Ligand binder design. Structure first.
Ligand SMILES: *[C@@H]1O[C@H](CO)[C@@H](O[C@@H]2O[C@H](CO)[C@@H](O)[C@H](O)[C@H]2NC(C)=O)[C@H](O)[C@H]1NC(C)=O
Ligand SMILES: [Ca+2]
Ligand SMILES: [Ca+2]
Ligand SMILES: [Ca+2]
Length: 226
């Protein structure tokens, strides 16, 4: 009961202490379901394929406070596989291909006001504009170059990723979604983002993220990540 409304970080669970006070202990891997399929497995950064995020996160939890735990991160969903190397040319296109991908992902994702449900008004307006522009690209005699149409998609993506935990930085684990097969040149994600980790704290901060995609510091709005 004391735990029914008590929530714990990823890889943890609430258990009552001696005083009956709820407390978050690392989850029991045995209390993790068996995957329905191989696709539900995940790959850590040291090329070790855990059986599910539950298994991974619970494992990483015991290692909390440890060096090994500090460096342990989810690389990508699905079992481990051969990942080709990111050639230097690939790494140069990555930000370019990525930001267009993000814009497009945003256009088909948020198409109607029903899609724009969890978006603030400021954001709703940004996608409206994105849509106004896209329609124009589908009919203007001579297409124009529009970097502005990248600002929101780029901010959006950051907020989407900044979840575990929502702190304003993206960890190797949080970038896992960007290592999926759908992403263009996903194999360049780690190399690229490392390139973005300016102060080298192993976290990509909003300015680091934005900067890496070519968003002017003037156009870095945190509201767009709300
Ligand atoms: C990471 O682990 C996976 C699984 O152990 C490795 O993938 C296999 O790699 C060899 C060739 O590199 C193939 O014969 C297997 O069929 C592979 N396929 C996959 C889908 O697992 C992978 O090579 C490991 N290491 C690296 C650096 O990728
Ligand atoms: Ca985070
Ligand atoms: Ca791909
Ligand atoms: Ca950093």
């Amino acid at each position: 009961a004391p735990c029914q409304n008590h929530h714990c970080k990823h890889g943890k669970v609430c258990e009552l202490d001696e005083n009956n006070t709820p407390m978050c202990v690392c989850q029991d891997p045995t209390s993790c379901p068996a995957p329905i399929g191989e696709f539900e497995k995940v790959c850590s950064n040291d090329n070790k394929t855990f059986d599910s995020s539950c298994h991974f996160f619970a494992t990483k939890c015991t290692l909390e406070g440890t060096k090994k735990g500090h460096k342990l991160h989810l690389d990508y969903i699905g079992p481990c596989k051969y990942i080709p190397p990111c050639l230097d040319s690939e790494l140069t296109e990555f930000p370019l291909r990525m930001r267009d991908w993000l814009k497009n992902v945003l256009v088909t994702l948020y198409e109607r006001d029903e899609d724009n449900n969890l978006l603030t008004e400021k954001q709703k307006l940004r996608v409206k504009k994105i849509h106004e522009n896209e329609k124009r690209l589908e009919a203007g005699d001579h297409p124009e170059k529009n970097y502005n149409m990248y600002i929101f998609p780029v901010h959006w993506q950051f907020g989407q990723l900044d979840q575990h935990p929502i702190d304003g930085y993206l960890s190797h684990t949080e970038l896992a979604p960007l290592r999926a097969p759908l992403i263009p040149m996903e194999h360049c994600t780690t190399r690229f983002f490392e390139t973005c980790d300016l102060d080298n704290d192993k976290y990509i901060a909003l300015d680091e993220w934005a900067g890496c995609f070519g968003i002017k510091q003037k156009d870095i709005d945190k509201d767009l990540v709300i």
